[PDB]
Amino acid sequence: LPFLSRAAFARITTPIARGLLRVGLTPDVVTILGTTASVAGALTLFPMGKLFAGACVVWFFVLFDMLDGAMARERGGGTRFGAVLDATCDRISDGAVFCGLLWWIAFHMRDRPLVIATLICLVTSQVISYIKARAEASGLRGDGGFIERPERLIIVLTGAGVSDFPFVPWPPALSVGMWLLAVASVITCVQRLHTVWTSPGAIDRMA
Amino acid sequence: ITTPIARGLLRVGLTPDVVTILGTTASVAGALTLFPMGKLFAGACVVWFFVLFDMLDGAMARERGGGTRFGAVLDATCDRISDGAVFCGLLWWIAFHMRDRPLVIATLICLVTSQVISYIKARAEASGLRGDGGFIERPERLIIVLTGAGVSDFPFVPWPPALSVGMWLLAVASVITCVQRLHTVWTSPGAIDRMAIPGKGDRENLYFQ
Ligand SMILES: CCCCCCCC/C=C\CCCCCCCC(=O)OC[C@H](O)CO
Ligand SMILES: CCCCCCCC/C=C\CCCCCCCC(=O)OC[C@H](O)CO
Ligand SMILES: CCCCCCCC/C=C\CCCCCCCC(=O)OC[C@H](O)CO
Ligand SMILES: CCCCCCCCCCCCCCCCCCCC
Ligand SMILES: CCCCCCCCCCCCCCCCCCCC
Ligand SMILES: [Mn+2]
Ligand SMILES: [Mn+2]
Ligand SMILES: [Mn+2]
Ligand SMILES: [Mn+2]
Ligand SMILES: [Mn+2]
Ligand SMILES: [Mn+2]
Ligand SMILES: [Mn+2]
């Protein structure tokens, strides 16, 4: 496995989770703390141009995201509230990532098309997840997309981080990552709506 | 009022879902063309017009013997996109043509919370819980932001501060609403019943609530 991957991190979530339980933390409190730290990092570092440090901080709390489930597993189970909270917190965290980067791009760069791309990523990031939740609320399916949420985050965070990379930065990488993610995200939206359409019971007329 | 319009659109060969998509595309085009140019009154009228137009898909579905679950999901998703475009369009004017960086922050809070408020409800329902209620739903959201924007640019007698009053009011009310709806999730029947967490992945050790 890649050394910074979630699959790698899953090899040490059990001792971490046991430690956090021992200290009296719960899964849901950990979800909130990690989300708050992630938002703080994105909204502090990105608007300052510290894109490599921000990307590292955000990626850490993508890994940290995995602790609430590991903790709940050690405690005998999770809850539906915990699942809703995790998902909701992920929406907020993603929103802060794009808002932080947006602040840097809008006010400290000269790339207005890139602002547009960042806004597309921001809105599609929410909508991609909304389609799936809203579909399931109606008893339909709404997943889909060639590229999953963690990998979508990898695209933009890699672009940001390389653009600000220590010693040997490649500034174009931020724009490359954002436009690639914008295109991928728009497509993912259409693909997910197609999954809704092909779900059992999706097009029966009622009432 | 709606029935004759709906029947006419059905005779054209339009369906509820096509009307949803068209109304949303027009609303998005209005917000993203008129708000970035500072035509906030015109943009607000265009957006409100297509809000009223979004009610026609339901009137049409009635005339057709009923709507579909897919149509409901599509309509709700389109509503998110339309709300996104409203705040993006205004953001562009505020960010690049005003000197009010705090207002940019308020606008971004509105942008994100407009999505998250709806998301909490849908995601709660996807788990058999509830996430409804709260101060800000879409009608209150649009009234506040579009009234502030329209008044700020009103013909003859504008009141420029209205844009900022509306955005800050909506920002604060929308954060509160997110907290309210998550409490509603928590109090929902079954929300904290313990559930077995099966491992996901090829190794069945990826654990998620
Ligand atoms: C020197 C250490 C950094 C070297 C690496 C380039 C750094 C790019 C900049 C910031 C990292 C933010 C993104 C980190 C993404 C890692 C994603 C990954 O490892 O892939 C596994 C994933 O869980 C499934 O694909
Ligand atoms: C024209 C002034 C309108 C300002 C409306 C603020 C109050 C609105 C009501 C409740 C929100 C209270 C929270 C206020 C937090 C905002 C503080 C701020 O920074 O105000 C700067 C403003 O953008 C300058 O137009
Ligand atoms: C309860 C859920 C709500 C949580 C929603 C949070 C998501 C982030 C949204 C808006 C903040 C975006 C702020 C962008 C960063 C601004 C940094 C900055 O430099 O501020 C400039 C200063 O005001 C100079 O006047
Ligand atoms: C002068 C330039 C004006 C730019 C206006 C701001 C552009 C914001 C771009 C994001 C638009 C938000 C709506 C996204 C629509 C995505 C549709 C998803 C497909 C289902
Ligand atoms: C520097 C910016 C810091 C912003 C903090 C962002 C906070 C994100 C986490 C929000 C999580 C919502 C928690 C509310 C839970 C409500 C449950 C009540 C029922 C008991
Ligand atoms: Mn988690
Ligand atoms: Mn998560
Ligand atoms: Mn998830
Ligand atoms: Mn996910
Ligand atoms: Mn409608
Ligand atoms: Mn609608
Ligand atoms: Mn509602």
Numbering used by the authors:
A (entry chain A): 4 to 210
B (entry chain B): 15 to 223
What does the publication say?
To unambiguously assign the metal-binding geometry we also determined the structure of the Mn2+—substituted protein to 1.88 Å resolution, allowing X-ray anomalous dispersion identification of the metal binding positions. In chain B of the M. tuberculosis PgsA1 homodimer, however, the anomalous difference density, corresponding to the aspartate-chelated Mn-ions, is extended indicating two alternate binding positions for the metal ion in site 2 (indicated as 2a and 2b in Fig. 1d, e). Besides the anticipated protein-bound metal ions, additional anomalous difference density peaks were found: two in chain A and one in chain B. These additional Mn-ions appeared to be coordinated by serendipitously bound citrate molecules, most likely derived from the crystallization condition. Two citrate molecules are chelating two Mn-ions in chain A and one citrate molecule is found chelating one Mn ion in chain B. The citrate-Mn complex is most likely not biologically relevant and result from the presence of 100 mM citrate and 120 mM Mn2+ in the crystallization solution. The presence of the metal ions and bound Mn-citrate ligand complexes in both protein chains appear to have a stabilizing effect on the N-terminal helix and C-terminal loop which now can be indubitably traced in the electron density. In the Mn-citrate complex structure one of the citrate carboxylates assumes the position of SO42− (1) in both protein chains. However, the Mn-citrate complex revealed a plausible binding pocket for this substrate.
One such potential target is the mycobacterial phosphatidylinositol phosphate synthase (M. tuberculosis PgsA1). PgsA1 catalyzes the conjugation of the 1’ hydroxyl group of D-myo-inositol-3-phosphate (ino-P) with a lipid tail of an acceptor substrate, cytidine diphosphate diacylglycerol (CDP-DAG), forming phosphatidylinositol phosphate (PIP). 1 D-myo-inositol-3-phosphate+CDP-DAG→PIP+CMP 2 PIP→PI+Pi PgsA1 belongs to the class I CDP-alcohol phosphotransferases (CDP-APs), integral membrane proteins that catalyze the formation of a phosphodiester bond to merge a CDP-alcohol and a second alcohol, releasing cytidine monophosphate (CMP). The M. tuberculosis PgsA1 was identified as a promising candidate for drug development, due to its essential role in growth and proliferation of the pathogen and differences between the Eukaryotic and mycobacterial PI biosynthesis pathways.
